[PDB]
Each structure stands twice: as C-alpha cells, then as structure tokens.
mmCIF file with all atom_site columns, C-alpha atoms and ligand atoms in Angstrom:
data_model
loop_
_atom_site.group_PDB
_atom_site.id
_atom_site.type_symbol
_atom_site.label_atom_id
_atom_site.label_alt_id
_atom_site.label_comp_id
_atom_site.label_asym_id
_atom_site.label_entity_id
_atom_site.label_seq_id
_atom_site.pdbx_PDB_ins_code
_atom_site.Cartn_x
_atom_site.Cartn_y
_atom_site.Cartn_z
_atom_site.occupancy
_atom_site.B_iso_or_equiv
_atom_site.pdbx_formal_charge
_atom_site.auth_seq_id
_atom_site.auth_comp_id
_atom_site.auth_asym_id
_atom_site.auth_atom_id
_atom_site.pdbx_PDB_model_num
ATOM   1   C  CA  . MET A 1 1   ? 0.160  -0.003 -0.218  1.00 48.44 ? 6   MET A CA  1
ATOM   2   C  CA  . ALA A 1 2   ? 0.681  3.564  -0.319  1.00 47.63 ? 7   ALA A CA  1
ATOM   3   C  CA  . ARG A 1 3   ? 1.386  5.126  3.011   1.00 47.48 ? 8   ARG A CA  1
ATOM   4   C  CA  . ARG A 1 4   ? 1.101  9.077  3.770   1.00 46.51 ? 9   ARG A CA  1
ATOM   5   C  CA  . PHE A 1 5   ? 4.724  10.709 5.197   1.00 47.32 ? 10  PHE A CA  1
ATOM   6   C  CA  . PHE A 1 6   ? 5.580  14.100 6.039   1.00 48.69 ? 11  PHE A CA  1
ATOM   7   C  CA  . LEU A 1 7   ? 9.317  15.419 5.408   1.00 49.21 ? 12  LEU A CA  1
ATOM   8   C  CA  . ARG A 1 8   ? 9.530  18.049 8.085   1.00 48.87 ? 13  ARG A CA  1
ATOM   9   C  CA  . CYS A 1 9   ? 12.584 20.511 7.205   1.00 48.91 ? 14  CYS A CA  1
ATOM   10  C  CA  . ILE A 1 10  ? 14.074 23.181 9.005   1.00 46.35 ? 15  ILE A CA  1
ATOM   11  C  CA  . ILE A 1 11  ? 16.208 25.863 7.502   1.00 48.25 ? 16  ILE A CA  1
ATOM   12  C  CA  . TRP A 1 12  ? 18.550 27.299 10.300  1.00 48.19 ? 17  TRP A CA  1
ATOM   13  C  CA  . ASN A 1 13  ? 20.843 29.154 8.559   1.00 50.80 ? 18  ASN A CA  1
ATOM   14  C  CA  . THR A 1 14  ? 23.372 29.184 5.407   1.00 51.54 ? 19  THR A CA  1
ATOM   15  C  CA  . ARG A 1 15  ? 27.395 30.121 5.226   1.00 49.44 ? 20  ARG A CA  1
ATOM   16  C  CA  . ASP A 1 16  ? 29.947 30.420 3.084   1.00 53.30 ? 21  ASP A CA  1
ATOM   17  C  CA  . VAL A 1 17  ? 27.147 31.253 0.167   1.00 54.18 ? 22  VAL A CA  1
ATOM   18  C  CA  . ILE A 1 18  ? 28.365 32.673 -3.473  1.00 54.73 ? 23  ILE A CA  1
ATOM   19  C  CA  . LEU A 1 19  ? 28.044 36.337 -3.669  1.00 54.61 ? 24  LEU A CA  1
ATOM   20  C  CA  . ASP A 1 20  ? 26.349 37.469 -7.090  1.00 51.70 ? 25  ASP A CA  1
ATOM   21  C  CA  . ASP A 1 21  ? 25.479 41.275 -6.544  1.00 53.82 ? 26  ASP A CA  1
ATOM   22  C  CA  . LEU A 1 22  ? 27.757 44.289 -6.606  1.00 52.32 ? 27  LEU A CA  1
ATOM   23  C  CA  . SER A 1 23  ? 26.317 46.747 -4.033  1.00 49.21 ? 28  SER A CA  1
ATOM   24  C  CA  . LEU A 1 24  ? 25.268 50.648 -4.733  1.00 48.43 ? 29  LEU A CA  1
ATOM   25  C  CA  . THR A 1 25  ? 28.382 50.995 -2.850  1.00 53.13 ? 30  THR A CA  1
ATOM   26  C  CA  . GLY A 1 26  ? 30.195 48.246 -4.849  1.00 53.01 ? 31  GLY A CA  1
ATOM   27  C  CA  . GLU A 1 27  ? 30.528 45.600 -2.209  1.00 54.04 ? 32  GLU A CA  1
ATOM   28  C  CA  . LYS A 1 28  ? 29.749 41.841 -3.169  1.00 51.13 ? 33  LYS A CA  1
ATOM   29  C  CA  . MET A 1 29  ? 26.593 40.542 -1.457  1.00 49.26 ? 34  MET A CA  1
ATOM   30  C  CA  . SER A 1 30  ? 23.775 38.054 -2.161  1.00 48.57 ? 35  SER A CA  1
ATOM   31  C  CA  . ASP A 1 31  ? 19.944 38.329 -1.112  1.00 45.16 ? 36  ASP A CA  1
ATOM   32  C  CA  . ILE A 1 32  ? 20.040 34.800 -0.156  1.00 43.34 ? 37  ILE A CA  1
ATOM   33  C  CA  . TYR A 1 33  ? 16.627 32.533 0.195   1.00 42.65 ? 38  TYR A CA  1
ATOM   34  C  CA  . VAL A 1 34  ? 16.373 28.855 0.169   1.00 41.18 ? 39  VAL A CA  1
ATOM   35  C  CA  . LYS A 1 35  ? 13.649 26.872 -2.240  1.00 42.36 ? 40  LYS A CA  1
ATOM   36  C  CA  . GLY A 1 36  ? 12.985 23.365 -1.335  1.00 40.38 ? 41  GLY A CA  1
ATOM   37  C  CA  . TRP A 1 37  ? 10.257 20.479 -2.663  1.00 37.45 ? 42  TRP A CA  1
ATOM   38  C  CA  . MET A 1 38  ? 10.904 16.960 -3.630  1.00 35.96 ? 43  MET A CA  1
ATOM   39  C  CA  . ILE A 1 39  ? 10.891 15.265 -6.799  1.00 39.15 ? 44  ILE A CA  1
ATOM   40  C  CA  . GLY A 1 40  ? 7.523  14.700 -8.270  1.00 39.20 ? 45  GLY A CA  1
ATOM   41  C  CA  . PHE A 1 41  ? 5.880  16.767 -6.101  1.00 37.37 ? 46  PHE A CA  1
ATOM   42  C  CA  . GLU A 1 42  ? 6.909  20.425 -7.811  1.00 34.61 ? 47  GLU A CA  1
ATOM   43  C  CA  . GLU A 1 43  ? 3.452  21.555 -7.442  1.00 35.12 ? 48  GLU A CA  1
ATOM   44  C  CA  . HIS A 1 44  ? 4.416  21.738 -3.489  1.00 36.83 ? 49  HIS A CA  1
ATOM   45  C  CA  . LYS A 1 45  ? 7.677  23.777 -3.951  1.00 38.61 ? 50  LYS A CA  1
ATOM   46  C  CA  . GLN A 1 46  ? 8.503  26.296 -0.810  1.00 36.19 ? 51  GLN A CA  1
ATOM   47  C  CA  . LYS A 1 47  ? 10.891 29.108 -0.160  1.00 36.00 ? 52  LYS A CA  1
ATOM   48  C  CA  . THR A 1 48  ? 12.347 30.564 2.657   1.00 33.57 ? 53  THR A CA  1
ATOM   49  C  CA  . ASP A 1 49  ? 12.153 34.757 3.480   1.00 36.05 ? 54  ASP A CA  1
ATOM   50  C  CA  . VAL A 1 50  ? 15.100 36.445 2.046   1.00 36.63 ? 55  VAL A CA  1
ATOM   51  C  CA  . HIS A 1 51  ? 18.035 37.434 4.248   1.00 36.32 ? 56  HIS A CA  1
ATOM   52  C  CA  . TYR A 1 52  ? 19.036 40.848 2.383   1.00 35.67 ? 57  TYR A CA  1
ATOM   53  C  CA  . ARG A 1 53  ? 22.283 42.390 1.518   1.00 37.64 ? 58  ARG A CA  1
ATOM   54  C  CA  . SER A 1 54  ? 24.464 39.156 3.157   1.00 37.00 ? 59  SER A CA  1
ATOM   55  C  CA  . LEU A 1 55  ? 27.729 40.737 3.035   1.00 38.05 ? 60  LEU A CA  1
ATOM   56  C  CA  . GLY A 1 56  ? 29.852 37.545 4.226   1.00 38.77 ? 61  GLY A CA  1
ATOM   57  C  CA  . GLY A 1 57  ? 27.617 34.662 2.917   1.00 37.20 ? 62  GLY A CA  1
ATOM   58  C  CA  . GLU A 1 58  ? 25.638 34.171 6.183   1.00 38.58 ? 63  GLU A CA  1
ATOM   59  C  CA  . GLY A 1 59  ? 22.146 33.915 6.212   1.00 38.44 ? 64  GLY A CA  1
ATOM   60  C  CA  . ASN A 1 60  ? 19.328 33.283 9.143   1.00 42.62 ? 65  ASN A CA  1
ATOM   61  C  CA  . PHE A 1 61  ? 16.359 32.252 8.663   1.00 40.65 ? 66  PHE A CA  1
ATOM   62  C  CA  . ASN A 1 62  ? 14.762 29.388 11.329  1.00 39.61 ? 67  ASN A CA  1
ATOM   63  C  CA  . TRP A 1 63  ? 12.270 28.319 8.357   1.00 39.87 ? 68  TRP A CA  1
ATOM   64  C  CA  . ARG A 1 64  ? 9.990  25.465 8.517   1.00 38.05 ? 69  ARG A CA  1
ATOM   65  C  CA  . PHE A 1 65  ? 8.809  23.377 5.673   1.00 39.33 ? 70  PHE A CA  1
ATOM   66  C  CA  . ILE A 1 66  ? 6.389  20.346 5.563   1.00 38.51 ? 71  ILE A CA  1
ATOM   67  C  CA  . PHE A 1 67  ? 6.623  18.397 2.252   1.00 36.00 ? 72  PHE A CA  1
ATOM   68  C  CA  . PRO A 1 68  ? 3.812  15.674 2.324   1.00 40.98 ? 73  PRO A CA  1
ATOM   69  C  CA  . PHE A 1 69  ? 4.647  12.443 0.177   1.00 43.89 ? 74  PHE A CA  1
ATOM   70  C  CA  . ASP A 1 70  ? 3.076  8.733  -0.484  1.00 44.70 ? 75  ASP A CA  1
ATOM   71  C  CA  . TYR A 1 71  ? 5.907  6.009  0.101   1.00 44.03 ? 76  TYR A CA  1
ATOM   72  C  CA  . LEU A 1 72  ? 5.942  2.220  -0.841  1.00 45.50 ? 77  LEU A CA  1
ATOM   73  C  CA  . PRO A 1 73  ? 7.992  0.926  2.515   1.00 42.51 ? 78  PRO A CA  1
ATOM   74  C  CA  . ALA A 1 74  ? 8.262  -2.608 0.603   1.00 43.50 ? 79  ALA A CA  1
ATOM   75  C  CA  . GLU A 1 75  ? 9.600  -1.070 -2.573  1.00 43.25 ? 80  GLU A CA  1
ATOM   76  C  CA  . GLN A 1 76  ? 11.418 2.123  -0.824  1.00 38.19 ? 81  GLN A CA  1
ATOM   77  C  CA  . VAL A 1 77  ? 10.112 3.985  -3.651  1.00 36.86 ? 82  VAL A CA  1
ATOM   78  C  CA  . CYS A 1 78  ? 7.926  7.435  -4.101  1.00 36.48 ? 83  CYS A CA  1
ATOM   79  C  CA  . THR A 1 79  ? 4.768  7.147  -6.093  1.00 34.26 ? 84  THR A CA  1
ATOM   80  C  CA  . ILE A 1 80  ? 4.963  10.806 -7.749  1.00 38.25 ? 85  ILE A CA  1
ATOM   81  C  CA  . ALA A 1 81  ? 1.152  10.530 -7.758  1.00 37.26 ? 86  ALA A CA  1
ATOM   82  C  CA  . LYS A 1 82  ? -0.301 12.055 -4.550  1.00 38.26 ? 87  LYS A CA  1
ATOM   83  C  CA  . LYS A 1 83  ? -3.863 9.588  -3.401  1.00 38.23 ? 88  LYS A CA  1
ATOM   84  C  CA  . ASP A 1 84  ? -6.916 8.147  -4.232  1.00 38.40 ? 89  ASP A CA  1
ATOM   85  C  CA  . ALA A 1 85  ? -8.473 9.042  -7.454  1.00 37.08 ? 90  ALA A CA  1
ATOM   86  C  CA  . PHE A 1 86  ? -6.889 10.563 -10.871 1.00 34.35 ? 91  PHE A CA  1
ATOM   87  C  CA  . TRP A 1 87  ? -8.092 13.948 -9.803  1.00 33.72 ? 92  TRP A CA  1
ATOM   88  C  CA  . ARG A 1 88  ? -4.843 14.083 -7.423  1.00 33.24 ? 93  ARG A CA  1
ATOM   89  C  CA  . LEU A 1 89  ? -1.987 15.836 -9.268  1.00 32.21 ? 94  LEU A CA  1
ATOM   90  C  CA  . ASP A 1 90  ? 0.682  13.434 -10.958 1.00 33.06 ? 95  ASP A CA  1
ATOM   91  C  CA  . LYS A 1 91  ? -2.648 10.910 -11.528 1.00 34.86 ? 96  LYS A CA  1
ATOM   92  C  CA  . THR A 1 92  ? -1.394 7.452  -10.385 1.00 37.45 ? 97  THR A CA  1
ATOM   93  C  CA  . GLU A 1 93  ? 1.807  5.329  -9.718  1.00 35.78 ? 98  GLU A CA  1
ATOM   94  C  CA  . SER A 1 94  ? 5.206  6.313  -11.281 1.00 35.87 ? 99  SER A CA  1
ATOM   95  C  CA  . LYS A 1 95  ? 7.942  4.865  -9.359  1.00 35.92 ? 100 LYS A CA  1
ATOM   96  C  CA  . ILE A 1 96  ? 11.043 7.137  -8.378  1.00 38.12 ? 101 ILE A CA  1
ATOM   97  C  CA  . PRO A 1 97  ? 13.294 7.638  -5.653  1.00 40.73 ? 102 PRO A CA  1
ATOM   98  C  CA  . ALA A 1 98  ? 12.275 9.960  -2.438  1.00 42.41 ? 103 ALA A CA  1
ATOM   99  C  CA  . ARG A 1 99  ? 14.717 12.580 -3.140  1.00 41.13 ? 104 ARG A CA  1
ATOM   100 C  CA  . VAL A 1 100 ? 14.522 16.191 -1.664  1.00 41.80 ? 105 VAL A CA  1
ATOM   101 C  CA  . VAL A 1 101 ? 15.894 19.137 -3.568  1.00 40.15 ? 106 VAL A CA  1
ATOM   102 C  CA  . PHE A 1 102 ? 17.166 22.267 -1.860  1.00 39.77 ? 107 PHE A CA  1
ATOM   103 C  CA  . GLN A 1 103 ? 18.320 25.272 -4.149  1.00 38.43 ? 108 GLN A CA  1
ATOM   104 C  CA  . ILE A 1 104 ? 19.755 28.381 -2.725  1.00 39.20 ? 109 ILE A CA  1
ATOM   105 C  CA  . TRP A 1 105 ? 19.062 31.490 -4.771  1.00 38.36 ? 110 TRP A CA  1
ATOM   106 C  CA  . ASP A 1 106 ? 19.883 35.035 -4.776  1.00 40.08 ? 111 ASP A CA  1
ATOM   107 C  CA  . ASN A 1 107 ? 17.019 37.305 -4.648  1.00 37.25 ? 112 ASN A CA  1
ATOM   108 C  CA  . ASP A 1 108 ? 17.021 40.408 -7.501  1.00 38.23 ? 113 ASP A CA  1
ATOM   109 C  CA  . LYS A 1 109 ? 14.121 43.390 -7.829  1.00 39.46 ? 114 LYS A CA  1
ATOM   110 C  CA  . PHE A 1 110 ? 15.671 44.470 -11.056 1.00 39.53 ? 115 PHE A CA  1
ATOM   111 C  CA  . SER A 1 111 ? 16.213 41.204 -12.509 1.00 39.15 ? 116 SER A CA  1
ATOM   112 C  CA  . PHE A 1 112 ? 15.495 37.512 -12.236 1.00 36.86 ? 117 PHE A CA  1
ATOM   113 C  CA  . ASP A 1 113 ? 16.262 35.854 -9.360  1.00 35.70 ? 118 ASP A CA  1
ATOM   114 C  CA  . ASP A 1 114 ? 19.843 33.892 -9.569  1.00 35.36 ? 119 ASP A CA  1
ATOM   115 C  CA  . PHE A 1 115 ? 20.544 30.607 -8.869  1.00 32.94 ? 120 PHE A CA  1
ATOM   116 C  CA  . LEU A 1 116 ? 23.642 30.182 -6.694  1.00 37.61 ? 121 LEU A CA  1
ATOM   117 C  CA  . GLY A 1 117 ? 23.648 26.468 -5.696  1.00 35.82 ? 122 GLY A CA  1
ATOM   118 C  CA  . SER A 1 118 ? 21.822 23.361 -4.757  1.00 33.33 ? 123 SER A CA  1
ATOM   119 C  CA  . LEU A 1 119 ? 21.774 20.165 -2.583  1.00 34.61 ? 124 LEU A CA  1
ATOM   120 C  CA  . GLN A 1 120 ? 19.859 16.764 -3.872  1.00 35.03 ? 125 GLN A CA  1
ATOM   121 C  CA  . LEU A 1 121 ? 19.456 14.340 -1.217  1.00 33.09 ? 126 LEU A CA  1
ATOM   122 C  CA  . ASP A 1 122 ? 18.124 10.716 -1.398  1.00 33.78 ? 127 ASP A CA  1
ATOM   123 C  CA  . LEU A 1 123 ? 15.885 9.842  1.679   1.00 31.54 ? 128 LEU A CA  1
ATOM   124 C  CA  . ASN A 1 124 ? 16.832 6.453  1.115   1.00 34.29 ? 129 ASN A CA  1
ATOM   125 C  CA  . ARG A 1 125 ? 20.959 6.881  0.865   1.00 34.97 ? 130 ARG A CA  1
ATOM   126 C  CA  . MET A 1 126 ? 21.708 10.427 2.172   1.00 34.39 ? 131 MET A CA  1
ATOM   127 C  CA  . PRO A 1 127 ? 25.255 11.819 3.761   1.00 36.55 ? 132 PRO A CA  1
ATOM   128 C  CA  . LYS A 1 128 ? 25.318 12.177 6.803   1.00 38.55 ? 133 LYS A CA  1
ATOM   129 C  CA  . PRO A 1 129 ? 25.615 15.873 8.095   1.00 36.74 ? 134 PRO A CA  1
ATOM   130 C  CA  . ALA A 1 130 ? 28.717 17.775 9.607   1.00 36.30 ? 135 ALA A CA  1
ATOM   131 C  CA  . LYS A 1 131 ? 28.311 18.811 13.214  1.00 33.48 ? 136 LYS A CA  1
ATOM   132 C  CA  . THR A 1 132 ? 29.723 22.683 12.450  1.00 30.00 ? 137 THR A CA  1
ATOM   133 C  CA  . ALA A 1 133 ? 29.701 24.711 9.063   1.00 29.57 ? 138 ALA A CA  1
ATOM   134 C  CA  . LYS A 1 134 ? 33.677 24.303 9.423   1.00 33.50 ? 139 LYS A CA  1
ATOM   135 C  CA  . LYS A 1 135 ? 33.176 20.607 9.033   1.00 30.94 ? 140 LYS A CA  1
ATOM   136 C  CA  . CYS A 1 136 ? 31.061 20.653 5.916   1.00 34.22 ? 141 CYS A CA  1
ATOM   137 C  CA  . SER A 1 137 ? 32.941 20.019 2.612   1.00 35.41 ? 142 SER A CA  1
ATOM   138 C  CA  . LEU A 1 138 ? 32.349 18.337 -0.471  1.00 35.28 ? 143 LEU A CA  1
ATOM   139 C  CA  . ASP A 1 139 ? 33.831 15.571 0.742   1.00 35.56 ? 144 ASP A CA  1
ATOM   140 C  CA  . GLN A 1 140 ? 30.710 14.887 2.561   1.00 32.86 ? 145 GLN A CA  1
ATOM   141 C  CA  . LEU A 1 141 ? 29.422 13.656 -0.748  1.00 30.48 ? 146 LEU A CA  1
ATOM   142 C  CA  . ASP A 1 142 ? 31.890 10.827 -1.308  1.00 32.40 ? 147 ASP A CA  1
ATOM   143 C  CA  . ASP A 1 143 ? 29.623 8.030  -2.171  1.00 26.80 ? 148 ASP A CA  1
ATOM   144 C  CA  . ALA A 1 144 ? 32.424 6.282  -3.754  1.00 27.86 ? 149 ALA A CA  1
ATOM   145 C  CA  . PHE A 1 145 ? 35.100 6.146  -1.435  1.00 25.07 ? 150 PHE A CA  1
ATOM   146 C  CA  . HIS A 1 146 ? 33.637 6.481  2.406   1.00 23.75 ? 151 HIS A CA  1
ATOM   147 C  CA  . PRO A 1 147 ? 30.004 4.687  1.359   1.00 21.21 ? 152 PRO A CA  1
ATOM   148 C  CA  . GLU A 1 148 ? 29.875 3.869  5.389   1.00 19.74 ? 153 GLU A CA  1
ATOM   149 C  CA  . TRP A 1 149 ? 28.963 7.903  5.237   1.00 16.29 ? 154 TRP A CA  1
ATOM   150 C  CA  . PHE A 1 150 ? 25.474 7.679  3.543   1.00 15.91 ? 155 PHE A CA  1
ATOM   151 C  CA  . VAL A 1 151 ? 22.367 6.818  5.445   1.00 15.30 ? 156 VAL A CA  1
ATOM   152 C  CA  . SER A 1 152 ? 18.566 6.500  5.548   1.00 15.95 ? 157 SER A CA  1
ATOM   153 C  CA  . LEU A 1 153 ? 16.665 9.180  6.932   1.00 19.35 ? 158 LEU A CA  1
ATOM   154 C  CA  . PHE A 1 154 ? 13.600 6.291  7.153   1.00 19.88 ? 159 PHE A CA  1
ATOM   155 C  CA  . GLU A 1 155 ? 15.512 4.361  9.729   1.00 19.80 ? 160 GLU A CA  1
ATOM   156 C  CA  . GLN A 1 156 ? 17.234 7.125  11.735  1.00 18.30 ? 161 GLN A CA  1
ATOM   157 C  CA  . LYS A 1 157 ? 14.091 9.429  11.458  1.00 19.43 ? 162 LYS A CA  1
ATOM   158 C  CA  . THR A 1 158 ? 16.335 12.845 11.982  1.00 20.42 ? 163 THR A CA  1
ATOM   159 C  CA  . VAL A 1 159 ? 19.181 14.288 11.014  1.00 20.42 ? 164 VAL A CA  1
ATOM   160 C  CA  . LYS A 1 160 ? 20.305 17.815 12.042  1.00 18.03 ? 165 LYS A CA  1
ATOM   161 C  CA  . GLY A 1 161 ? 23.550 19.433 10.742  1.00 18.79 ? 166 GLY A CA  1
ATOM   162 C  CA  . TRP A 1 162 ? 25.471 21.133 7.828   1.00 17.28 ? 167 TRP A CA  1
ATOM   163 C  CA  . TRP A 1 163 ? 25.558 20.003 4.019   1.00 20.14 ? 168 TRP A CA  1
ATOM   164 C  CA  . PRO A 1 164 ? 27.200 21.784 1.240   1.00 18.64 ? 169 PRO A CA  1
ATOM   165 C  CA  . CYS A 1 165 ? 25.623 23.091 -1.555  1.00 18.29 ? 170 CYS A CA  1
ATOM   166 C  CA  . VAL A 1 166 ? 27.142 22.581 -5.107  1.00 16.61 ? 171 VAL A CA  1
ATOM   167 C  CA  . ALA A 1 167 ? 27.653 24.409 -8.346  1.00 16.41 ? 172 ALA A CA  1
ATOM   168 C  CA  . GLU A 1 168 ? 28.871 23.094 -11.554 1.00 12.86 ? 173 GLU A CA  1
ATOM   169 C  CA  . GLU A 1 169 ? 31.669 24.945 -13.506 1.00 15.06 ? 174 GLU A CA  1
ATOM   170 C  CA  . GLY A 1 170 ? 30.780 22.371 -16.206 1.00 11.26 ? 175 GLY A CA  1
ATOM   171 C  CA  . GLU A 1 171 ? 32.131 18.895 -15.265 1.00 12.88 ? 176 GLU A CA  1
ATOM   172 C  CA  . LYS A 1 172 ? 33.537 20.375 -12.168 1.00 13.78 ? 177 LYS A CA  1
ATOM   173 C  CA  . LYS A 1 173 ? 31.817 20.552 -8.652  1.00 11.90 ? 178 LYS A CA  1
ATOM   174 C  CA  . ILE A 1 174 ? 32.214 24.245 -6.705  1.00 16.45 ? 179 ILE A CA  1
ATOM   175 C  CA  . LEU A 1 175 ? 31.126 24.025 -2.842  1.00 17.36 ? 180 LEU A CA  1
ATOM   176 C  CA  . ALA A 1 176 ? 28.512 27.034 -3.552  1.00 17.20 ? 181 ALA A CA  1
ATOM   177 C  CA  . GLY A 1 177 ? 27.099 27.184 0.021   1.00 17.86 ? 182 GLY A CA  1
ATOM   178 C  CA  . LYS A 1 178 ? 26.665 25.225 3.320   1.00 17.56 ? 183 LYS A CA  1
ATOM   179 C  CA  . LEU A 1 179 ? 23.114 24.691 4.631   1.00 17.14 ? 184 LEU A CA  1
ATOM   180 C  CA  . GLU A 1 180 ? 22.559 24.211 8.454   1.00 17.60 ? 185 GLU A CA  1
ATOM   181 C  CA  . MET A 1 181 ? 19.068 22.146 8.688   1.00 19.46 ? 186 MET A CA  1
ATOM   182 C  CA  . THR A 1 182 ? 16.724 19.601 10.448  1.00 21.95 ? 187 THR A CA  1
ATOM   183 C  CA  . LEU A 1 183 ? 15.307 16.820 8.250   1.00 16.71 ? 188 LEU A CA  1
ATOM   184 C  CA  . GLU A 1 184 ? 12.525 14.572 9.890   1.00 15.92 ? 189 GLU A CA  1
ATOM   185 C  CA  . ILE A 1 185 ? 10.371 11.990 8.315   1.00 15.26 ? 190 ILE A CA  1
ATOM   186 C  CA  . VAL A 1 186 ? 6.905  12.027 10.127  1.00 11.63 ? 191 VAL A CA  1
ATOM   187 C  CA  . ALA A 1 187 ? 4.317  9.491  10.035  1.00 8.76  ? 192 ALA A CA  1
ATOM   188 C  CA  . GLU A 1 188 ? 0.296  10.616 10.160  1.00 9.20  ? 193 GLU A CA  1
ATOM   189 C  CA  . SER A 1 189 ? 0.225  8.369  13.532  1.00 6.15  ? 194 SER A CA  1
ATOM   190 C  CA  . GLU A 1 190 ? 3.375  7.316  15.730  1.00 4.82  ? 195 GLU A CA  1
ATOM   191 C  CA  . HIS A 1 191 ? 5.137  7.263  18.926  1.00 8.20  ? 196 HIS A CA  1
ATOM   192 C  CA  . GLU A 1 192 ? 6.344  11.148 19.644  1.00 5.32  ? 197 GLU A CA  1
ATOM   193 C  CA  . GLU A 1 193 ? 9.833  9.870  20.324  1.00 8.49  ? 198 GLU A CA  1
ATOM   194 C  CA  . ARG A 1 194 ? 11.593 6.663  20.036  1.00 7.65  ? 199 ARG A CA  1
HETATM 195 CA CA1 . CA  B 2 .   ? 21.519 39.005 -8.453  1.00 5.77  ? 201 CA  B CA1 1
HETATM 196 CA CA1 . CA  B 2 .   ? 20.421 40.162 -5.279  1.00 7.09  ? 202 CA  B CA1 1
HETATM 197 CA CA1 . CA  B 2 .   ? 19.628 38.621 -11.589 1.00 6.55  ? 203 CA  B CA1 1
HETATM 198 CL CL1 . CL  B 3 .   ? 18.096 44.026 -7.807  1.00 5.73  ? 204 CL  B CL1 1
#
C-alpha cells in the first residue's frame, strides 16, 4: 500500500554562500533565500523569506518546510502521484526514488533571481551531516570511497547539521554554500519520540 508521510525541514542558516551582486556602494553581496521541494511534487515547492544584503555569505532563516509525500515501504520507492482518485496531481503511480531538493538563490528586485547552488538528497541513501559549518565540505558527498557516510533517513527518522551546496563549473563541482538543517520524516500516527 501507499503510506502518507511528511518531510519536516527546518532551514536554520546558510554560510559561505556565493555573492552574486555588487551593492550600490560596490560591495559583493547576495539576497539569500532557500527553495525546497520533493522530486515528483514540484507543485508543493516552498521557499524561505529572504536574508537581504548578505555581505559574508551568511543567512539566518529558522524556517520550517513541510513536504507531504506517498511512499511504498516494501519497494522503498516514491509514487509521484498523490493519493486516491485521478483528480490528484501526478495521476497514478510512476515509481521514483524519494529525493528532496534544496536550492540557494539570490533575490533581485530589478532582474530575475539568480541560482547560486543546490543539494539533492536521496531519503534512502543520504550523506551524514557535519556537526559544524567548518567541518562541512564536499567530501561529505563521497559515495564512492566512504559509503559508510551515507545513510537512510527512514531508519534514522531525524538528522541535523550542515550539508554543502554545489554549483557545476561544467563537469567540475564547486562549493556554493553550506546549509544548516534539521530533517525529519514524520508518520501520520506514531510515538512522539523513539
Ligand atoms: Ca543578482
Ligand atoms: Ca540580489
Ligand atoms: Ca539577476
Ligand atoms: Cl536587483
């Protein structure tokens, strides 16, 4: 059966975010905000408020996202279709991995917002978070050589800490920002804590 879950995301802060603009005084800065959504549920995407005029790449948000999604425990696969009748968005089935996306953006008033970097996470196999922003690095993404550093959120239920965001210089990967988050998968009915 398809079971209804909820991904609860708190965006606490960002650090080291790329600075995309020049100030009227001529100082590098970004008007930072964070976009999030689950793949296959692009209709429910959400964003934080904007941390205006970040001069050192830091932003403060303390923002809560809730992402509802359907899940097949036995298949460990997302059903991009919501629930019940065809009236639901994404019709029926389509089985894909459960993944959430976080994107860091610079808000502009007099042009379009500019993409700064993103992080895409597999809820079944995701990199462990760094305790501090200092220990946050692209090494966290090393699924090839340190597979023990990937884990499953469904098993752990909750993870907190820092993850890196990435921008592609063509094939090359560059640290575009660091994201401090709490991630928790929540059931419709279960014990408050285990
Ligand atoms: Ca800009
Ligand atoms: Ca801007
Ligand atoms: Ca722009
Ligand atoms: Cl602007």
